[PDB]
Structure formats: structure tokens, C-alpha cells
Write an enzyme that holds these catalytic residues in place. Sequence first.
Site, PDB file in Angstrom:
ATOM      1  N   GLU A  22       0.809  -1.179   0.000  1.00 38.19           N
ATOM      2  CA  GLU A  22       0.000   0.000   0.000  1.00 38.19           C
ATOM      3  C   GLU A  22       0.848   1.236   0.000  1.00 38.19           C
ATOM      4  O   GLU A  22       2.042   1.185   0.281  1.00 38.19           O
ATOM      5  CB  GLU A  22      -0.912   0.032   1.235  1.00 38.19           C
ATOM      6  CG  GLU A  22      -0.170   0.140   2.550  1.00 38.19           C
ATOM      7  CD  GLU A  22      -1.068   0.328   3.750  1.00 38.19           C
ATOM      8  OE1 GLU A  22      -2.126  -0.332   3.833  1.00 38.19           O
ATOM      9  OE2 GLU A  22      -0.704   1.107   4.683  1.00 38.19           O
ATOM     10  N   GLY A 138       6.962  -9.123  -8.433  1.00 38.34           N
ATOM     11  CA  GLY A 138       8.413  -8.884  -8.305  1.00 38.34           C
ATOM     12  C   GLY A 138       9.054  -9.490  -7.059  1.00 38.34           C
ATOM     13  O   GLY A 138      10.281  -9.406  -6.923  1.00 38.34           O
ATOM     14  N   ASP A 179      12.714   8.306  -6.732  1.00 38.58           N
ATOM     15  CA  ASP A 179      12.063   7.870  -5.466  1.00 38.58           C
ATOM     16  C   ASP A 179      12.405   6.418  -5.141  1.00 38.58           C
ATOM     17  O   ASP A 179      11.530   5.631  -4.769  1.00 38.58           O
ATOM     18  CB  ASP A 179      10.535   8.075  -5.477  1.00 38.58           C
ATOM     19  CG  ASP A 179       9.940   8.086  -4.095  1.00 38.58           C
ATOM     20  OD1 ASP A 179      10.702   8.311  -3.137  1.00 38.58           O
ATOM     21  OD2 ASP A 179       8.732   7.800  -3.977  1.00 38.58           O
TER      22      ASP A 179
END
EC number: 2.7.11.1
Length: 328
Positions: A22, A138, A179
Site C-alpha cells: 500500500e 516482483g 524515489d
Amino acid sequence: GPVPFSHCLPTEKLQRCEKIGEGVFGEVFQTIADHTPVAIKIIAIEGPDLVNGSHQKTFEEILPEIIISKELSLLSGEVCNRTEGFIGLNSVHCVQGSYPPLLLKAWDHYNSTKGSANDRPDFFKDDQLFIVLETEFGGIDLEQMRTKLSSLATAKSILHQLTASLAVAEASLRFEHRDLHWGNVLLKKTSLKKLHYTLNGKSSTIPSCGLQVSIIDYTLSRLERDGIVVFCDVSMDEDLFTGDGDYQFDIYRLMKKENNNRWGEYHPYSNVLWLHYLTDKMLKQMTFKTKCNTPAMKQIKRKIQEFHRTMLNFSSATDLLCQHSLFK
Ligand SMILES: *[IH]c1cn([C@@H]2O[C@H](CO)[C@@H](O)[C@H]2O)c2ncnc(N)c12
């Protein structure tokens, strides 16, 4: 026009959804189709309601991360600049409807076991729009693997994989991730001993140490094709540059220093900054099952320490890959 959730998540696929992550953006689920795990990222768009404390993106505001997802996924099939180190993109849909009850069930299970910082996404109406991205699964993020990796040899493989992927994306797309915190580095088992990439027509290999790395989350990323730049303009964002308590938050400030608050420009030094932050995590926060109790392993440790204290003098991930002693 938009599709119902059932187009993306037919019954059996919906029934197999489990929440795996999340963010303020929304929710990530894992499910299975054709015997293969996939991840499903669901982001509410275009509506007036606050979601997890923030306004929803418009279609214009979400398009960059979709475009960048696609471009980076396509690098797995290229020739001169080829990498599998970004997450594979299977599909993107614009969905309309209330949140599926079976996904709320999954959301509740996660909240009950792991805890959530998000609002329960049960307040959307039947006209709500979402973007649903289906990607390769992943594995598990580096943060969640803090205590689970074998040794610093594994760390070296992870750094080499990350640096190579970023270099390939710099060369092909003038990419900056912007990021790359340790929630955005995913690790999955592979039986491959060597992983392959090609950088400006020269192919090489990386010992895997049994792991394949995937980079995710392109919300702040930048790239260009034929001088058309796709990016997130954070020049007027306050909150992004005022974090503390983790080196992560200094990286946002260090990027802003490097680019003079001009986010459309290409400054691949940002990729070096993130790789330094990740190296710093490897040395200061990760704890390994086996220590460097041998001389050859004490040497890997020394080389990663040397990387940490020298890498900020390199101009790009490409510079690092091609010139740093850690990768020779
Ligand atoms: I795209 C994606 C995202 N995650 C998990 O959700 C968190 C928030 O983005 C991440 O930190 C990570 O734990 C994924 N996990 C596996 N596979 C994919 N593609 C994921």
C-alpha cells in the site's frame, strides 16, 4: 470508455487476490492467472474525495507514471539498451465502479495481520474511476527483507543489478527514478546463476546470488524520448522536501539542490544519490544471516564500504557501472 472491475479481475482471479502492499496512492494485490503470480495496483482517479488523506490524481496527472511503466518494461525486449530490471507491465485499464467486496475482504485481512495506514476503500460510488495496473510479481521489497538476506555478497549483487538497470535506462531514456527508497526494490528467487543486460550495445552479466531485482513505482520519475519529457513537476511541493528521520528524506533535498528545482531537466546524478541511499541501507540497516567471517567476504564488505564513500563522486549510474571498481 472505462471497463468494470470484472474485466481485469474475473471471478477466479478476484477470489485469489491477497493484499501485498500500500501507499498513499492506493493498494497493491497479488493474484494468479495462467498459473503465474501477478501484482495488481489500483489507484482512484478523477474524483473529489480525499483518499488516504490526499486528493486523487487526474487522468493527466497519472499518465506519466503509466507511460514510464510501459517504456521501462519494454527495455526487456530491446537490443542496444536491454534490461529486465524494471517491473514487467502486463496491462493497464481504466476501470469504473465501486470497490469489489472481495478486494475489501483482502484489505481487511491485511489490516488485521499487518496493519494499514490507509482508509478502508469502501466509500467509492459506482461512478468512481480507477487505474488498474497489472504487473509482473516482483517478490518482496528490500525493506521487508531487512533480516532475510544471506550475506553482503547478496547485497553486492543487488547493488550491481540496480546500477545496471538504471544505467540502461539512462542510456535509452534519460531516465531518473527519483524515489528509489527500499520499498521500491523488489527481490525474487531465480535459478539463473548469471543475469544479462546490454548497455549501448555491449552485453555483460551479473552474478545473481539467487535473486532477481525489480525496480518499481514511477510516480516521481522522469524520462524523455525525442526531446519530449515526461515527469512529475514537484517544484511547488512543500511536504516532499521537509521530511526527517531517514536519509531518504535528505535525498529529496539533495535532488532539489542538484537540479535547482527544475524537474524537467536531466540530472542522472539523482540515480547516484538513490544508489548511495540504498548502499547506506545495506551497510547500516540490513542484517545478514551470515556475517563476513572469512577473508574473501571481509573483502566484499570493504569494497561495498569503499563504494559508499566514493560513489557520490560519479555523475550517473552509467558512470558507476562502467568505471567503479566494485563492478570489475
Ligand atoms: I507495483 C508492486 C508493489 N509491491 C508491493 O507494494 C508496496 C507498495 O508499492 C511495495 O513496497 C511492495 O511491497 C509489489 N510487490 C510485488 N510485486 C510488485 N509488482 C509490486
